Amino acid sequence: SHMSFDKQNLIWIDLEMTGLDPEKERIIEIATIVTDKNLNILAEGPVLAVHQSDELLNKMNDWCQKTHSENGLIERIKASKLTERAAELQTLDFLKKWVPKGASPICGNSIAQDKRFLVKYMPDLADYFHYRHLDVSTLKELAARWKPEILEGFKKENTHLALDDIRESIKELAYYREHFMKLD
Amino acid sequence: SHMSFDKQNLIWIDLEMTGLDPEKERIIEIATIVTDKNLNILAEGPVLAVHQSDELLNKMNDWCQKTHSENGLIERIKASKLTERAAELQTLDFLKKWVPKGASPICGNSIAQDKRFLVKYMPDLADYFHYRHLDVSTLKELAARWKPEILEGFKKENTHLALDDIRESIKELAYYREHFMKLD
């Protein structure tokens, strides 16, 4: 229990995956961040390279192998000893100190894609989430149709650091609260 | 091609399903609506009861059987001759006259849940969608944390008419554009 454990805290998550159909693809990296309802970061969670065979890595579309390599993820996947369960337990453990099970929706960009894989490879985690999604890209889509000018002034970056990735998804939300919301 | 075919039009969809895990559950109703980017309804699409065995209907959680019956959906499922493909082809056919393939994100409430089932039982349809989700409940979650007062003034209704269901999801969005957005 940290002091800021609260049922309105938000769980951000960003998987790395080896392809898009979970039924032949697997997780290869997992990261999480907890913020308060107002997007103030509380904690950064386990950033973990989940190990996977060399053949599944070899079946990877040429685009993903390029990225994962230049980032260096594969170097970690291949030096990883973590199982999916090891990854998951470690993240759960973490989450548990900051938000109650079932309270936060799943938060990040396009996170429906991540959740497909959780549901198959990390269902306890998938269950730790409220059923609802808090998809930042939802807002991008709306802005692109109802207020595109604000989009010519926010275009984020990568980095081989998952925690930086989440942070930009958050940055992005923070940006829509600013120039696309009316909070009063 | 109707005059208002446009790459920014939005496709709204609402499945009815027999349980939540697609891997043992199936579609039993499908409906769609196309709006323009500004949520003006263009067309209502095929509202179709997809037929499913009596045993899968019998394996249905007691909660879903209650609802589907009082609505009368089952009476249709059971009088249905439509296959998943028949349903799907008919919806595609429809969509094709109003939005290009791959342009609209998937729109409605919690639509990640629907898309799980499309992806397994109606993949051509699932493919007709841009990968991004436009989840109205995303906004509800944000309002509930950053401006809850507006939530004490919008609480929609059911009806055994899918097209009415979508219409409320839309109504809801329309409501957030009003009291939760700042469009300038």
UniProtKB/Swiss-Prot annotation, chains A, B:
Keywords: Cytoplasm, Exonuclease, Hydrolase, Nuclease. GO terms for cellular component: cytoplasm. The active site is at Y131. InterPro entries: Exonuclease_RNaseT/DNA_pol3 (IPR013520), Oligoribonuclease (IPR022894), RNaseH-like_sf (IPR012337), RNaseH_sf (IPR036397). GO terms for biological process: DNA metabolic process. It is found in: Cytoplasm. SMART domains: EXOIII. It is an enzyme of class 3 (hydrolase). Pfam families: RNase_T. Belongs to the oligoribonuclease family. This is Oligoribonuclease. It comes from Haemophilus influenzae (strain ATCC 51907 / DSM 11121 / KW20 / Rd).
